[PDB]
Structure 1
């Protein structure tokens, strides 16, 4: 069985500068996201670890999507360079065809006082590669929708995460 990596890259832009975005969206995700987006995320529960590298966490989805769950593994947190690396180790997306999906979310500063959210998705493949363009685009739409709610909240409550 052939091993490969299908790599997809995308960017989101934010008005919020990287330090604030990282404190909010990444370092306090488990608390902030189920609160702002209840329909999208019901809860975030740590199964193993203290929230840092090696942490295993089960995310349960709300009424918005065809609610299942996902199990993420924290691979890396760079609090200086605003890098968050994690893998989907249990979920609907995984099959005999896709064994693992590793992610890297980097926050880059904009000269206008904002951020560029750079997301890389690495689909670790086994056998014939068959990835639907619509399935990837739907993930990108859900990620930008959740993110837009993060930006709004942050702009409505400017003192939060400073």
Structure 2
């Protein structure tokens, strides 16, 4: 029986937008917001099974920017009051014989200056010898980063939304 392990990588950035508005727009309204403002990034998001809570299975189809590829996510948890959203990658290019699943956690933390700290944890569920490239991981972190800036810009330009 092959070695089962977990490789954990955590990363953070800041936003001028405080957690309640950021969690409502960027996290809870991702399916509707991102295809609408960034069609090149996301073509659409479709719920396959569930209502939007824990256990929900959803397929995200990318735009031209990611060669109309796609990812399938399972929602592992949602804590609206603490701004925590957990989900697993259950179908995607990042999975292999070596990486069977990636569980992510996005947590919004408030700061005293009125902003947010966006804390992203990636947990890679490994099988056998572990061979994880820093370039492969950091391209995934850059990806999430440049997209967030499009969301942040839009929310600043449309202050009446997600209040």
TM-score with structure 2 setting the length? 0.97
- Secondary structure of 1:64's partner? helix
* Residues in 1 aligned to 2:146 and 2:130: alpha-carbon distance in whole angstroms: 28
* Residues in 2 aligned to 1:31 and 1:15: alpha-carbon distance in whole angstroms: 22
**What is aligned with 2:57?**
56
- Do residues 80 (structure 1) and 54 (structure 2) align? no
* Residues in 2 aligned to 1:9 and 1:108: alpha-carbon distance in whole angstroms: 14
Report the CA distance between 1:51 and its aligned residue: 1.0
Report the CA distance between 1:147 and its aligned residue: 0.4
Q: Deviations over 1:118-160 (max 9, x none)?
A: 0000000001111111111111111011100111000000110
Report the CA distance between 1:66 and its aligned residue: 3.2
* Residues in 2 aligned to 1:110 and 1:144: alpha-carbon distance in whole angstroms: 19
* Residues in 1 aligned to 2:93 and 2:16: alpha-carbon distance in whole angstroms: 33
Report the CA distance between 1:36 and its aligned residue: 1.2
Moved more, 62-71 or 17-26: 62-71
- Secondary structure of 1:30's partner? helix
Report the CA distance between 1:68 and its aligned residue: 1.3
Taking the TM superposition and a 5 Å limit, the aligned residue runs for 1:79-98 are 79-98=80-99
* Residues in 2 aligned to 1:129 and 1:67: alpha-carbon distance in whole angstroms: 29
CA RMSD of aligned residues (A): 0.7
Q: Deviations over 1:39-85 (max 9, x none)?
A: 11111000000111110000001101233110000010000000000
* Residues in 2 aligned to 1:12 and 1:46: alpha-carbon distance in whole angstroms: 28
TM-score with structure 1 setting the length? 0.98
* Residues in 1 aligned to 2:68 and 2:44: alpha-carbon distance in whole angstroms: 12
* Residues in 2 aligned to 1:24 and 1:63: alpha-carbon distance in whole angstroms: 23
Gaps of 5+ in 1: none
Gaps of 5+ in 2: none
- Secondary structure of 2:95's partner? coil
